[PDB]
Amino acid sequence: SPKLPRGLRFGADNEILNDFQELWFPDLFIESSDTHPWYTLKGRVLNAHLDDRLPNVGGRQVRRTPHRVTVPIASSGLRPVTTVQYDPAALSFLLNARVDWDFGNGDSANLVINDFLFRTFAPKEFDFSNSLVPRYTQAFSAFNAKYGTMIGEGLETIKYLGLLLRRLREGYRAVKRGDLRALRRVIQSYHNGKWKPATAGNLWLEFRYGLMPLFYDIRDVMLDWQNRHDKIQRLLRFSVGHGEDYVVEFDNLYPAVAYFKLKGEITLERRHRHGISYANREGYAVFDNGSLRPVSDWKELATAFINPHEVAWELTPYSFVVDWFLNVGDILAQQGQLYHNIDIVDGFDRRDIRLKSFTIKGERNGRPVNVSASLSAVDLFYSRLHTSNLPFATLDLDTTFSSFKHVLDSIFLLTQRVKR
């Protein structure tokens, strides 16, 4: 859509939304651009010093997708998968060879071929679903066993943040009430030695400095939670795949005016991988990236009470701490939605062809000839299509994480119950 890059699109209130029809079902253009139009011979053959520069094969024909760009799809959501295509009619390779031999009545040569390309049949069509769906199912059945302790351990952390925020609120409340007794009773728990001067009662100083042990406990937990939460969300991405070798033979290619014939075998790696993406079913369609906060925001909130030079204590303290509570709640609620309605939102079925090494054999008129060569691949196959269904999905994550959301929503309401 004009005014925007390929992958983006304006929303209902002119938001920066991913054009899913362009990312997932893009129009394919054919590229025939001759990438390596020349090749060189630089040596001697049968007492004829050659230093030529010759054209190699053309008619590249590569079906491929236009470069697009994306914005995130859930709260601290990674970017959605984009459908990609690079599908040649045939695989192209560049040969940098030294062919040399000395025999017969001055029937000698030693020449350097460079950037001479040839193509081979492309084995684009393969499916490894039979190797993948076992691996998928094994991953699903095993999941609750593997992470069950890790997940519940991260759950324990978030409940404990709730205890600290609760305790902090008791503290704040006492200041708002003016009850210095109760404030010092809250402070008292953090030092085993029970001391209380009362040289001059100052609620806000005693709050700010008295509750340092708590602010430290909070910081640590807050940061630990974020780290455990970000690890947990990664569990929703599931990827499985399998690779297999394949051999294609190239033969009777004559560089240098048919003085000699080369032949060989290339060992390819055909690989198939499949990914699936669990997230909030509501979230992906119209996720406003403007409503999304930076990761720095949470990390800053943890330390805000620690922040040595803070003007606001001296002149607008009630606002300062109430605002803090609201920002914290807000972020926790936003995370609460990430354990709410879990389904598969995105995923991919990618197959490609890589290059493992090769053998060259060079024969002249029936007679073997020494050949020493380097191979680099120009055109190889790669096809990654988006899919959002997977018949084999066993998991009911909603009930795995049901406990999580209840806690995050509980804490959120606690933070709303703070008053100026």
UniProtKB/Swiss-Prot annotation:
How the protein is affected by changing A198T? In strain: TW18
- State how it assembles: Interacts with host MurA; this interaction inhibits the first step in host cell wall synthesis. Interacts with the capsid protein.
Instruction: State how changing F404Y affects the protein, per the record.
Output: In strain: TW18
Q: What is the effect of changing R219K?
A: In strain: TW18
Q: Where is this region: RNA-binding?
A: 158-176, 226-236, 294-298
Note the effect listed for N110D: In strain: Qbeta_2_FR
What happens after mutating Y254C?
A: In strain: Qbeta_3
Outcome after substituting F29L: In strain: Qbeta_2_FR
Keywords, A to Z, come to:
Cytolysis, Host cell lysis by virus, Host-virus interaction, Viral attachment to host adhesion receptor, Viral attachment to host cell, Viral attachment to host cell pilus, Viral release from host cell, Virion, Virus entry into host cell
Please name the InterPro entries in this protein's record: A_protein
What does the UniProt entry say about where the protein is found?
Virion
Listed result of changing N389S: In strain: TW18
The protein's name in its UniProt record: Maturation protein A2
Q: Which family does it belong to?
A: Belongs to the Leviviricetes maturation protein family.
Q: What does this protein do?
A: Induces host cell lysis. Inhibits host MurA activity thereby blocking the synthesis of murein precursors necessary for the host cell wall biosynthesis. May be responsible for the attachment to the host pilus. Makes extensive contacts with the viral genome.
Q: Which processes are annotated in GO (biological process)?
A: adhesion receptor-mediated virion attachment to host cell; symbiont-mediated suppression of host cell wall biogenesis; symbiont-mediated suppression of host peptidoglycan biosynthetic process; viral release from host cell by cytolysis; viral release via suppression of host peptidoglycan biosynthetic process; virion attachment to host cell pilus
Recorded consequence of changing S189F: In strain: Qbeta_3
User: What organism does the record attribute this protein to?
Assistant: Escherichia virus Qbeta (Bacteriophage Q-beta)
Would you name any one GO CC term? virion component
Please give the annotated consequence of changing Y246C.
In strain: TW18
- Impact of altering D100G? In strain: Qbeta_2
